[PDB]
């Protein structure tokens, strides 16, 4: 997809996931720009799970599958964000193993993506 289509997809993904949770605009907008530097609510952590389920990158137990994640990236991000996305997925392939609840597992994985992103990281 193109950069324009990707930026638009972020809003489409949030539009589908946000209604399921009680969330604050100011928390979602920090996630959007890669700022995972604040205390998440339980709702916000499960929100990241909802999003990652949509990508087919995690199971219901919040176990991240880097091979599958990598296989999904070709139709999820534009050419320009491929190397960054591959690098973050690879760096964070085992993050979920350090945590014990499915929502926490995915949230910490996404936080790790943002910490290992060499450029502008973005979350729906």
Number of strands: 0
Quick one: biggest sheet? none
The geometry reads as globular
CATH superfamily: Pheromone/general odorant binding protein domain
Structural class: mainly alpha
CATH topology: Recoverin, domain 1
**CATH architecture tag:** Orthogonal Bundle
Helix content range of the residues, please?
Answer: 55-70%
Count, helices = 6
The total number of structural domains is 1
- Proportion of residues in β-strands: under 5%
CATH class: Mainly Alpha
- Rg result: 13 Å
Topology as H/E string?
A: HHHHHH
Task: Give the N-to-C terminal Cα separation.
Answer: 16 Å
Protein described:
Belongs to the PBP/GOBP family. It comes from Drosophila melanogaster. The longest helix has 15 residues, at about 5-15. The protein has six helices and no strands. The protein is globular and about 35 Å long. The chain has a single domain (about 1-124), classed as Pheromone/general odorant binding protein domain (Recoverin, domain 1). With about 120 residues, it is mainly α. Helix 3 crosses helix 6 and helix 5 (about 80-90) packs across helix 6 (about 100-115).
